[PDB]
Amino acid sequence: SHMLFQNVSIAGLAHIDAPHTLTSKEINERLQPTYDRLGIKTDVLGDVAGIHARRLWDQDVQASDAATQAARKALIDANIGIEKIGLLINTSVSRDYLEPSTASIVSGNLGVSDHCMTFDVANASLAFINGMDIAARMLERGEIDYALVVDGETANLVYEKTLERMTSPDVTEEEFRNELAALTLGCGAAAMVMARSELVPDAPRYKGGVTRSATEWNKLCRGNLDRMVTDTRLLLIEGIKLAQKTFVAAKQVLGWAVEELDQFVIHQVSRPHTAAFVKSFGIDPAKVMTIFGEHGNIGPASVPIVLSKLKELGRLKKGDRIALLGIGSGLNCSMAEVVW
Amino acid sequence: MLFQNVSIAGLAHIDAPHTLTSKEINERLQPTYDRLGIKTDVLGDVAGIHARRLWDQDVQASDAATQAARKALIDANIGIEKIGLLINTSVSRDYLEPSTASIVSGNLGVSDHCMTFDVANASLAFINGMDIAARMLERGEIDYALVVDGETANLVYEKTLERMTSPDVTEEEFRNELAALTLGCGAAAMVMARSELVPDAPRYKGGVTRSATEWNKLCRGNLDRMVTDTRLLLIEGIKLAQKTFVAAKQVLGWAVEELDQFVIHQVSRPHTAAFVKSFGIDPAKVMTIFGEHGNIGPASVPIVLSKLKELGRLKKGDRIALLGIGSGLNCSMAEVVW
Numbered sequence: 001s002h003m004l005f006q007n008v009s010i011a012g013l014a015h016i017d018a019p020h021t022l023t024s025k026e027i028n029e030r031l032q033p034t035y036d037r038l039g040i041k042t043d044v045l046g047d048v049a050g051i052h053a054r055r056l057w058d059q060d061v062q063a064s065d066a067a068t069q070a071a072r073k074a075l076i077d078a079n080i081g082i083e084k085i086g087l088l089i090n091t092s093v094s095r096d097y098l099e100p101s102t103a104s105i106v107s108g109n110l111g112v113s114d115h116c117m118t119f120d121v122a123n124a125s126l127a128f129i130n131g132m133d134i135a136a137r138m139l140e141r142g143e144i145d146y147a148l149v150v151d152g153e154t155a156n157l158v159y160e161k162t163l164e165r166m167t168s169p170d171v172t173e174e175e176f177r178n179e180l181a182a183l184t185l186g187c188g189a190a191a192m193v194m195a196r197s198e199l200v201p202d203a204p205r206y207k208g209g210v211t212r213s214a215t216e217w218n219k220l221c222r223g224n225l226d227r228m229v230t231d232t233r234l235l236l237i238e239g240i241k242l243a244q245k246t247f248v249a250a251k252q253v254l255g256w257a258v259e260e261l262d263q264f265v266i267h268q269v270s271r272p273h274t275a276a277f278v279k280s281f282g283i284d285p286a287k288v289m290t291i292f293g294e295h296g297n298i299g300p301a302s303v304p305i306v307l308s309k310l311k312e313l314g315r316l317k318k319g320d321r322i323a324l325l326g327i328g329s330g331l332n333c334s335m336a337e338v339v340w
Numbered sequence: 341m342l343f344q345n346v347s348i349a350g351l352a353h354i355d356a357p358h359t360l361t362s363k364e365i366n367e368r369l370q371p372t373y374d375r376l377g378i379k380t381d382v383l384g385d386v387a388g389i390h391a392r393r394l395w396d397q398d399v400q401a402s403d404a405a406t407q408a409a410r411k412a413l414i415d416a417n418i419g420i421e422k423i424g425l426l427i428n429t430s431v432s433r434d435y436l437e438p439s440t441a442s443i444v445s446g447n448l449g450v451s452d453h454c455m456t457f458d459v460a461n462a463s464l465a466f467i468n469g470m471d472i473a474a475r476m477l478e479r480g481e482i483d484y485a486l487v488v489d490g491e492t493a494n495l496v497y498e499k500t501l502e503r504m505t506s507p508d509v510t511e512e513e514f515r516n517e518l519a520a521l522t523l524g525c526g527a528a529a530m531v532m533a534r535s536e537l538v539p540d541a542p543r544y545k546g547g548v549t550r551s552a553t554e555w556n557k558l559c560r561g562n563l564d565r566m567v568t569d570t571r572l573l574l575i576e577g578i579k580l581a582q583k584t585f586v587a588a589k590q591v592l593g594w595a596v597e598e599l600d601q602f603v604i605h606q607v608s609r610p611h612t613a614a615f616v617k618s619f620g621i622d623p624a625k626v627m628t629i630f631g632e633h634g635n636i637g638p639a640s641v642p643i644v645l646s647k648l649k650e651l652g653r654l655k656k657g658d659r660i661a662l663l664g665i666g667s668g669l670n671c672s673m674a675e676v677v678w
Binding site (some may be wrong): 003007093094096097098099100101102103104105108111114115116117118119120121122123124126127130133137141142177211212213214215216217218221222223224225228242245250299324328330331332 | 343431432433435436437438439440441442443445446449450452453454455456457458459460461462463464465468472475476480481513549550551552553554556557559560561562563580583635666667668669670
């Protein structure tokens with residue numbers, strides 16, 4: 001068995017795209033005097049990072065609100081009412097308060113029953129996979145019939161404040177480079193209904209996968225509500241090394257061979273970061289969908305949003321072996337498999 | 341259906357070093373007490389908090405959680421390389437990203453096989469963390485797990501006290517920020533393990549959870565502010581626990597008299613007393629540290645359990661109930677057989 005999940009399925013899946021488009025052209029327009037003062041002549045966002053646009057919410061939209069929208073849509077996709085949900089896990093980096101959990105707020109909005117167990121899981125960009133794993137263990141045991149995993153991300157504040165700091169006449173080069181990665185973030189939401197396979201015989205199967213870590217690199221990317229500081233160079237270098245370890249483990253327990261997988265759903269930080277990843281592991285780029293160019297990095301929601309879009313586009317066929325890959329601040333790297 | 345192969349290998353707690361008494365707080369609030377015409381000692385006489393502990397300046401949650409974790413490892417007689425999972429369950433947190441757990445892990449020097457993340461669920465998160473770890477242990481995914489929790493309330497005291505002594509504050513502003521002055525600093529950590537590795541260790545049975553998420557607006561807190569309505573929390577919490585007991589006194593075969601210890605999360609002395617009274621619980625079987633330490637959030641339950649252990653109180657076979665009502669509302673009840 002290799003400790004892989006049995007009889008755990010995905011009954012429903014949905015994503016929400018934030019409505020307001022913010023182009024990198026517009027951002028560069030604001031940053032140009034700082035660019036000129038700093039001697040920067042290259043479009044670091046559009047040409048280097050490879051981000052042309054990202055999406056934002058309204059100011060008054062909280063993480064719980066975005067997650068709730070995604071959740072209502074996932075339930076419809078699974079054709080079930082909220083009364084069937086026995087577990088709700090929120091996995092977003094963004095959060096309303098220190099307490100209560102964002103999950104309890106979303107659950108309050110949806111109207112879960114008194115039997116519904118809820119809490120948040122936080123683990124940077126890999127948290128949704130952690131949420132799926134935690135749910136999978138309860139579903140496999142048969143403690144619950146259905147679970148919701150939800151994730152709403154809000155980057156409005158970090159965009160507002162970073163742009164203000166970076167347009168300061170007294171901003172330093174170092175501070176500018178430190179905070180630049182925050183301008184690759186985007187808003188969005190995703191939700192997944194998981195279920196015991198007996199209940200949804202034709203639904204895709206979730207097997208789970210492997211995790212490797214490098215927690216001595218926990219300082220590389222630190223973020224709060226209004227600010228994110230990132231060592232992009234070291235993230236690339238140490239990320240690839242960690243992914244290498246995880247891939248070796250993935251071949252051991254998942255029996256993976258790149259050419260035998262049909263889709264790779266990869267969490268993305270930037271275009272060259274992804275290209276380095278794809279190249280180092282000999283992956284077919286035609287099996288790697290990217291939304292980064294127009295939506296940017298949506299944290300832990302990135303993986304399920306891309307998966308949901310793949311389904312929406314009709315790219316997933318019955319029998320397709322789908323790899324869920326990611327490197328998250330930690331450092332952590334998780335690799336799991338979905339059989340459509 | 342309960343957990344069969346899950347044990348508690350190690351347990352530890354950290355008491356914060358600095359004492360701030362309610363008498364000392366009241367001296368600072370006295371000019372505001374003399375305005376507004378307030379003559380009641382709400383902290384000391386009503387809430388039942390006479391003191392709390394604060395960390396030194398610039399101590400993060402991860403620092404406190406790291407301290408507790410080092411002690412829990414020692415109590416368990418294992419090195420950090422044995423740990424396959426580390427969960428941080430604290431309300432307090434260093435950043436939104438990355439996890440506070442990854443920072444604690446980096447401090448400890450966990451191996452590249454160690455899985456880490458945070459769990460947030462108000463005062464119940466430690467029990468959530470124990471359950472999540474318990475399931476991985478039973479599946480054979482890991483042999484040892486660390487559940488850690490450090491809380492810091494230094495900033496929320498500094499900020500609230502600043503506000504309360506401002507010349508513009510009203511009687512209603514004042515009252516609604518007394519709740520923050522019932523919080524305390526502290527940290528706890530637990531090592532959990534597969535039972536065939538630790539045959540003498542206490543067994544963890546798991547438990548039940550009931551929720552009333554319709555009341556998620558009652559207690560909202562951040563690092564520098566907390567706003568509450570304690571009165572509503574009391575009635576609806578107890579009502580929730582009653583539903584949880586129906587499930588608890590069914591799945592866990594629970595009967596109040598046949599339980600040896602009650603490790604209960606405390607919001608205040610009156611809240612605790614009403615709970616004990618409502619369910620016919622022997623109050624002698626309910627150890628309390630609230631009077632001296634205040635509310636330590638989700639670390640409260642493991643801290644008291646650790647203190648019970650250190651006292652050499654618990655005996656083999658003791659049936660211990662971990663009980664808590666958390667912001668949500670959530671109510672979890674679990675059993676540990678010593």
